Design a protein around this ligand. Structure first.
Ligand SMILES: [Ca+2]
Ligand SMILES: [Ca+2]
Ligand SMILES: [Ca+2]
Ligand SMILES: [Ca+2]
Ligand SMILES: [Ca+2]
Lengths: 147, 146, 147, 147, 146
């Protein structure tokens, strides 16, 4: 009965990811919703992962009620960052419309390493927390419309 | 009479009301009915409409059009610009893809001040214009027999 | 027998829109093509409008040979303009590919009122006319390939 | 038996376009491939044209083995150059994946007339020849995977 | 064992060799096999993978995953950010659209020096990471039973 979410986390900063993962798990537990957790090389692999789960569920696998996307992108000195942030947000959003699914977007786009934690921890910004609530919020509507 | 679905994203309850007020007014004045749901951000509006569309395919509410409302001010963080482009993009695509009437009332201003100059139905009434856009599209959608 | 296209115009500035429309109409008349005209609030609603026409044609509705999209986007003070410029273009481009249809893109993106007129007027740059001519060229290619 | 490609050229600057087309045609000649040439007014019209060709093939029309897209965008005064550059590239790439086709991308995006010649001329950068060759390369990979 | 298709876009033969080397090493180390095909630019990579997928359908090689390699060095012109943007965009979509495992090894650096820092396996081993990324995605793809 209680929604079972699939948390897809992209981690390069074990410390940071742990903050978001905790943040997301926090809000989810308080809401009393079960969940699994898979790990991917980067934010860009999050969409495909969700896509894998949907395909699996269509083959009798776990039929998730919603998904939470966690990851951290910091704009360093290389150009391989602005692209990740944009395209990940784009893919996730399209996937959400295309597959008519609930997806909490916790892919944080931070400038420096500092803001990464400000937004990471659940005590401060708790962006991982909002992601879960967003997910559940979306799961709620998804249910409401009986999609 | 057209039954619209108003999907709003709200972070600043206040600003969101000026917009929902505008949208609701415009729809009321045109004699259109509607339901209202809420989402945490502009980016979730596309998916919400998607749900409604799927839901209607399974005996759910058969909406005639949609009204998207939200506010995205460019502050300092980068999690603003991207939200603005994608929301607009996803909404536009959704409308073409599903061939549906969508009133785009997602505001993209530079500051809190410009937000109300667009929100309040006393000013630019962006919410009202969005609702009217929706109605316009619904009318076009019918005229063509889509 | 002669090409019949659907002019979809987004009109905020009534005068500018009349100028573009005059341009589009003059070019279409000159080639011997016919057309219907529908109005929408903004450039962003043109792709869907065309989408409506295509659907309606699949239901015994009007069968257009091509489309002309007319609109005027003036980079004002608000940031809500560069978005309309990009997406309208991208949305139209995709639609033309996705649906293999002839679309003259006459959505102007100008810096101000002055350039709007410089571009909208048939007497000057005639973008409405060029968009119509582009639609006609595309219809020609479309017929040539037998699509 | 030799590859037969369709060259879709966006033609605005006649001389540059001729250089470009000369580069492509020469590259296709040297490899023994044949080609048809169609003209559109802008780069944004190339993807759809290719779309028509594909639709026509299904309708008993000419079956092409690959496509060469030629065009020249020079960042000038209008803001309708950054959009054309990105969206045409995006549209073509998207089209190549979606339809699994061989497309040589010779749409040039240069800062000025001088660089346009440096790139367009077969005797220099020969971007037209590169695109025609890129197209033949993709046709080769296409046959290789038996697609 | 997994059989991958490495699609490399190569202009700078030296950098390409680095990435390829790094990718092959990471795949052999995991016991995965692979075929290598070469394209002119990063933008042809998505379509190449598309050809593979297509060919599989006709009794052609069935790949369990793909590794895309290329290096886009932002020069003095802006026609590098386009290639960089659209290739990353196209691969991400193909991975979602076809639900396949794709290791993104397309490098987007500021200068040549950085390319080598990312290309060399002794360094940031981006080629190896893309290959590893692909394996991970293959594992996950298996886990969910995609
Ligand atoms: Ca002046
Ligand atoms: Ca010089
Ligand atoms: Ca095939
Ligand atoms: Ca090891
Ligand atoms: Ca097979």
């Amino acid at each position: 009965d209680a929604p079972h979410l699939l948390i897809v986390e992209a981690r390069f900063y074990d410390d940071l990811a742990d903050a978001l993962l905790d943040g997301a798990k926090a809000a989810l537990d308080e809401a009393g919703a079960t969940y699994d957790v898979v790990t991917v090389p980067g934010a860009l692999e999050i969409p495909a992962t969700i896509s894998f789960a949907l395909d699996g569920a269509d083959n009798g696998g776990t039929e998730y009620d919603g998904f939470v996307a966690l990851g951290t992108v910091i704009r360093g000195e290389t150009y391989h960052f602005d692209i990740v942030s944009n395209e990940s947000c784009r893919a996730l959003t399209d996937l959400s419309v295309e597959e008519s699914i609930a997806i909490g977007n916790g892919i944080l786009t931070v400038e420096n390493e500092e803001q990464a934690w400000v937004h990471a921890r659940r005590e401060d910004k708790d962006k991982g927390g909002f992601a879960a609530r967003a997910a559940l919020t979306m799961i709620g509507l998804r249910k409401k419309f009986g999609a």
